[PDB]
UniProtKB/Swiss-Prot annotation, chain A:
Location(s) in or outside the cell: Virion membrane; Host endoplasmic reticulum-Golgi intermediate compartment membrane; Host cell membrane
Notes on the domains: Contains sequence and structural motifs very similar to those of a bacterial superantigen and can directly bind and activate T-cell receptors. Activation of a broad T-cell repertoire may be involved in the hyperinflammatory syndrome in acute COVID disease. The KxHxx motif seems to function as an ER retrieval and binds COPI in vitro.
Gene, per the UniProt record: S
Reported effect, Q63H: In strain: Eta/B.1.525
Glycosylation sites: N6, N43, T62
Top-rank taxon, per record: Viruses
Stretch list, region Disordered: 11-26
Effect recorded for S80L: In strain: Omicron/BA.2.12.1
Disulfide cross-links: C7-C35, C48-C57
Other remarks on this protein: Variant D614G has become the most prevalent circulating sequence in the global pandemic since April 2020. The mutation is associated with higher viral loads produced in cell culture and animal models. It would not change pathogenicity nor neutralization properties vs vaccination. May be prevalent because the mutation increases virus transmission in human population.
Protein name per its UniProtKB record: Spike glycoprotein
Lineage start: Viruses, Riboviria, Orthornavirae, Pisuviricota, Pisoniviricetes
Family: Belongs to the betacoronaviruses spike protein family.
From Swiss-Prot, chain B:
Official protein name in the record: Spike protein S2
Lineage per the UniProt record: Viruses, Riboviria, Orthornavirae, Pisuviricota, Pisoniviricetes
Site residues (Cleavage), renumbered to this chain: R107, S108
Start and end residues of each stretch annotated as Fusion peptide 1: 108-128
Gene, per the UniProt record: S
Glycosylation sites: N1, N9, N93, N356, N380, N416
Region annotation (Heptad repeat 1) ranges: 202-252
Region named Disordered: 120-135
Superkingdom, natural source: Viruses
Intrachain S-S bonds: C30-C52, C35-C41, C314-C325, C364-C408
Full-length numbering of the shown residues: 709 to 1147 of 1273
UniProtKB/Swiss-Prot annotation, chain C:
Gene it is expressed from: S
Function as written in the Swiss-Prot or TrEMBL entry: Subunit of the fusion protein that is processed upon entry into the host cell. Mediates fusion of the virion and cellular membranes by functioning as a class I viral fusion protein. Contains a viral fusion peptide that is unmasked after S2 cleavage. This cleavage can occur at the cell membrane by host TMPRSS2 or during endocytosis by host CSTL. In either case, this triggers an extensive and irreversible conformational change that leads to fusion of the viral envelope with the cellular cytoplasmic membrane, releasing viral genomic RNA into the host cell cytoplasm.
Protein name (record): Spike protein S2'
Effect caused by changing F33L: In strain: Eta/B.1.525
Source domain of life: Viruses
Region Heptad repeat 1, annotated ranges: 65-97
Organism: Severe acute respiratory syndrome coronavirus 2
Effect of D95N: In strain: Delta/B.1.617.2, Mu/B.1.621
From Swiss-Prot, chain D:
Range of the intact protein held here: 709 to 806 of 1273
Domain of life (superkingdom): Viruses
Listed result of changing T8I: In strain: Alpha/B.1.1.7
Protein name as annotated: Spike protein S2
Function of the molecule: Precursor of the fusion protein processed in the biosynthesis of the S protein and the formation of virus particle. Mediates fusion of the virion and cellular membranes by functioning as a class I viral fusion protein. Contains two viral fusion peptides that are unmasked after cleavage. The S2/S2' cleavage occurs during virus entry at the cell membrane by host TMPRSS2 or during endocytosis by host CSTL.
Lineage: Viruses, Riboviria, Orthornavirae, Pisuviricota, Pisoniviricetes
Disulfide bonds: C30-C52, C35-C41
Glycosylation: residue positions: N1, N9, N93
Record gene name: S
Amino acid sequence: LYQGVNCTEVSVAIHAPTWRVYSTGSNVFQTRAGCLIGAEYVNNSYECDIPIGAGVCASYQTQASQSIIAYTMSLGAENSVAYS
Amino acid sequence: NNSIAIPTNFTISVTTEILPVSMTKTSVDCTMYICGDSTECSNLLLQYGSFCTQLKRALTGIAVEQDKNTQEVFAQVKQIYKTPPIKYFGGFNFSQILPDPSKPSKRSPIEDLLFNKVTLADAGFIKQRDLICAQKFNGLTVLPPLLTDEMIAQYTSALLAGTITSGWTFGAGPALQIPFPMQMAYRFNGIGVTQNVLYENQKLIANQFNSAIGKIQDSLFSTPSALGKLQDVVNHNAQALNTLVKQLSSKFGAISSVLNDILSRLDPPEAEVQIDRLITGRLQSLQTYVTQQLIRAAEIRASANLAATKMSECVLGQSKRVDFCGKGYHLMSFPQSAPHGVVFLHVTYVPAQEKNFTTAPAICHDGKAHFPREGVFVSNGTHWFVTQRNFYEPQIITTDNTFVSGNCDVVIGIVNNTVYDPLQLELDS
Amino acid sequence: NGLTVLPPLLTDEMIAQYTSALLAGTITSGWTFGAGPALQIPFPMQMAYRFNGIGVTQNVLYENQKLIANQFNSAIGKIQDSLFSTPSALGKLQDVV
Amino acid sequence: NNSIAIPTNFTISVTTEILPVSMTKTSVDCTMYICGDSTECSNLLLQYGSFCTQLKRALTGIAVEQDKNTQEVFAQVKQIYKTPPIKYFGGFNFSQIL
Amino acid sequence: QSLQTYVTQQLIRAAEIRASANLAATKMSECVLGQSKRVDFCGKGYHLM
């Protein structure tokens, strides 16, 4: 996570230039905490495993393609009480 | 020595408490602040040791705790309870505290006047003559909270919808359903008043409540200085991040405040002396910022542990501790979210309209002393009666509302009267 | 050298008129003054309820009222001694001055 | 498996608890303390910045709090209640506390 | 530095007197303006007044 950056400035500087020289290519994605490169965003929702910020968590989950997925957290299950 | 006053009506009061729960998560890049682009500074700092790896470890634990402070107040419900479709709860109106679907935030008519009334500059969003955003440089970054303001409001909706639908049963195990007019009759028996005082005055109790909840809007609102405990936080932190950036402009005893001028107006030896004058007074302004943040973070942790004890003993149960959940005898409490804090609305029962009477310790009826079984003996001038203690409801002294214990000689005040016996009178027909 | 102790806002004669109103509301009303209007109750009758809230019946205070009044009138008298005669009871309030 | 002990009398106990509520409220005049006041050190002190307005601000919150601490323990009651002129309360003697 | 070290030790000693003044206000509301069922909050024994 490059914290505090638009995902279109780590691309147009990775094409030198950025400090940390070591590079990486996988799946850029803009969160409200920064740019996550290396993790795919699902649309499902699960409990928090590794916090990242602003509602987003990450985890190593099979797909047995095992990779690091990113998702928005679930605050719990649903339940309506039969009030009459 | 023989006078008592007993309340003849009641009032329903809704009060409000604001407690701060979390502060701002901040980070700093020692070098970028002390040195900058200079590489001579960078290599003259390697000799003050890890006075910089121990400033990151400290500001990083102050931040990881700000997210535990919040998880311990609002995350306390197992599931996400939803309130029925048709909203009729006995004549009671919760429209200003329940979620508003119209609006796009799913906030309540009053968690909306609390948000648009707390100004700030905490910007974790990537969207950066302007705002405090101007501190965003020198190595100073504000980090975003892990629970968005709409997730803290979806936990406050599950607590206010498990208390209106299940009572206090959701915090002790599974949620069990109870008609609402009948959960408020078990909250009246916990403060000492019988259940027939509600059922027989239910439209007055509902009106006195509906009217008091609709005066909180005006109150908290118009009066423009109640959210002043959740506005100090916001301010106290800004003034601190501003005195840190405005101390990079001081010379601490040097040719000037610009490392470069010195490195372009003096020589290789006379710089490595004017530059330590700065590499010192800038490692002391960062150790002061961190010590004062570790002291304020310990006072928000104390407040966030009181707000978690009040959410469990006031909002998930009825409390018998005096003045923990409002002035009066507690009945119910409801949570509402604010920026960086929580607001508790406390419903209480206040005794009103008191009359004076004459009392007796016991009553003598046949060479035997009778004592009240759950109330107090009173006289309206001529006849004697047994009432309850917190509401005047008189009754005739019988052998079913009184217990016997001794001869009429050892109690100091015993009065003579008649303790009617049901049975006998009936064994007369 | 530029150092100055500032005075407190509530004089020690005002902090003792607040302690006198709290003791004259308990002896003459009960726990009724901290929840609403203050309502009068004969005192031997407020102690009877105290007993009913610790688990004992009222017949046990009215048929022992003179002994309970003596046991107490003696326990308060033997406080003067302890605290004072023990020069070190008020050590928390001193270790901060 | 078949025995209980039940009390046959009682004692009235009066204990005592002492708790600190406030400290001393102090202030300092940076310049008079450091620059001996009577000296032109007040000119080598300004090249140091807000290290003297940050301290006066901190010692003023320590001092406005010591007054809220006291108004929360004692200023609870609403009215100033007074005891009856005749002081017989069932046989109990509250003379050493009143 | 001598001033900065005094203001730091009064800010740490004042947070300890706010914890004792916050317990003394809880014990005036629960032990003096009511009867407590909390064991040993208000003395050893079952509390009366």
